[model samples]
Target: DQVLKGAALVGHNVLVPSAQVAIDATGSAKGVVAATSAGFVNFEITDANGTFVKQLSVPASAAGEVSFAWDGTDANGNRMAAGKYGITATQTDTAGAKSKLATYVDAPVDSVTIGSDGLYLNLTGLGTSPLANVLRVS
Candidate 1:
């Protein structure tokens, strides 16, 4: 039988607000990175600009698929009145290879829809994943 099925769970997902973000492209690239291993996954979030942002990780139960939300707030929890930002999600295949998923959403997102049926993402244009990882990122 299949270990996990599509739409099996929901509500455990995250949604971000900004569509544009800055990637350091120097010291270290910032953004959401999703890596997968032998039936395991790791996620990391960082700021390419500075340290005013919050870098978080995916919950233990949810492995590969990492979701983040930035509400124009800095590390000090102060909200930025206005500015240009970017959003991205990187996924790694089972072979230890990493893939980055990115997009620029025009509007600032306040929330995302999640359910207990399982995580769902339309990764058709994002990248590829292993058979065991049964989640998608839209």
Candidate 2:
């Protein structure tokens, strides 16, 4: 039996009216880093200018994917505007190895395609994203 046989979840044109963004990291073990040996992680949200917006503490180890939600606010609990945003993950292993994950952006959908690889959604200004990567839609 195949333990894992799919792609990472992606969300296109994810509305942020309330400034809440959620992601499900379920099939990228090698790409994900753990905060500690016991399994913890950090999720961050930033603006297009690369300004810090918000940070989340996720208690999850490597391999087993975890779900995370970011309230659309800055370091302070203030609702952000409805617009495109950037997201990234970071982890510090027990051996003190700090690594950063790939940054994924939330943008409006432009088009759709179905290729041999899988279904994809073209996010305006972000290129094509796998439909499987979509976690939340609004």
Candidate 3:
């Protein structure tokens, strides 16, 4: 028993459609972003053609994840169409070093399974993901 140690349990998984999330008529887009280093992280929403829609800025104190809720409106004062959109992000550290971080989409979680190996996320239609790769934020 000495060989075993206590560890954190599994939390909800953040599925990355590269953020391929659908913005319903209510114009709601929400999800989480994973950060590896402490810095400034910005989430960029773009259309199918790679057109800029909106940008969300967040500050990170350490290596972790941040939750995001896009109001579905462009900074240009325009409401985006109701459909799927992709999100990209970049992080800048104290020294001004920039790095691109992976984006995860907010999809419907069918369920999750916990076995001897670990926890697995059942992302609706998008397949399953592990808990370690996910950053569950409020």
Candidate 4:
């Protein structure tokens, strides 16, 4: 099995959803974004080398969660290779406050462990990630 390593602010006003399972080229990857209040949400995807792949935007409602999707494709609609990729997101609050949310990475699961840090999914290529960060499985 594979997994995605997602990092996020523990108490941030805005939250970006993360994937729990690995994404394949033929399927769609899903996530969510929750806003503490009404604002704008911006998201983008990048390859492991930091190459920009795609971007999305949405006007979020107060304290609401919105679902989003991604196909393993670049901006040109070409299928991306199976490997690591980055997902970055940002949010702006109604009070004009803006925050750059933590990003996520795609990788294969090497193993699973439980420790003082809680549940962690050890990944190939990158490293371990908190299982709690997982938002979607497929």
1 against 3, candidate with superior TM-score: 3
TM-scores for every candidate against the unseen true structure? 0.31, 0.51, 0.66, 0.57
Across 1-138, the per-residue lDDT of candidate 2 in tens digits comes to 111222222333532222223332221101122233445568777776878887877765564444556555668877766555566777666566666644333446566666788676765544566665654453
TM-score of 4: 0.57
Model 1 per-residue lDDT tens digits across residues 64-112 = 4343445455557655443334344445444556555443222212222
Query: Compared to the true structure, candidate 2 yields what TM-score?
Result: 0.51
Candidate closer to the true structure by TM-score (higher is better), 1 or 4: 4
User: Compared with the true structure, what per-residue lDDT tens digits does model 4 show for residues 1-138?
Assistant: 232223222212222234222355565655565666678777787776777887777788776765556776777888877655667777888888987754443344556676775667665444555676544443
For lDDT, candidate 1 versus 2, the one ahead is: 2
Q: Which whole-number lDDT from 0 to 100 does residue 19 have in model 4?
A: 29
- Models ranked on lDDT: 3, 4, 2, 1
lDDT of 4: 0.58
Number of the top lDDT candidate: 3
Query: Candidate 4: which stretches are off by over 4 Å?
Result: 1-22, 94-96, 102-138
Task: Give all candidates' CA lDDT scores.
Answer: 0.36, 0.52, 0.69, 0.58
- Top candidate, metric TM-score: 3
CA RMSD per model (angstroms): 12.5, 9.4, 6.3, 8.5
Question: Candidates 3 and 4: which is better by lDDT?
Answer: 3
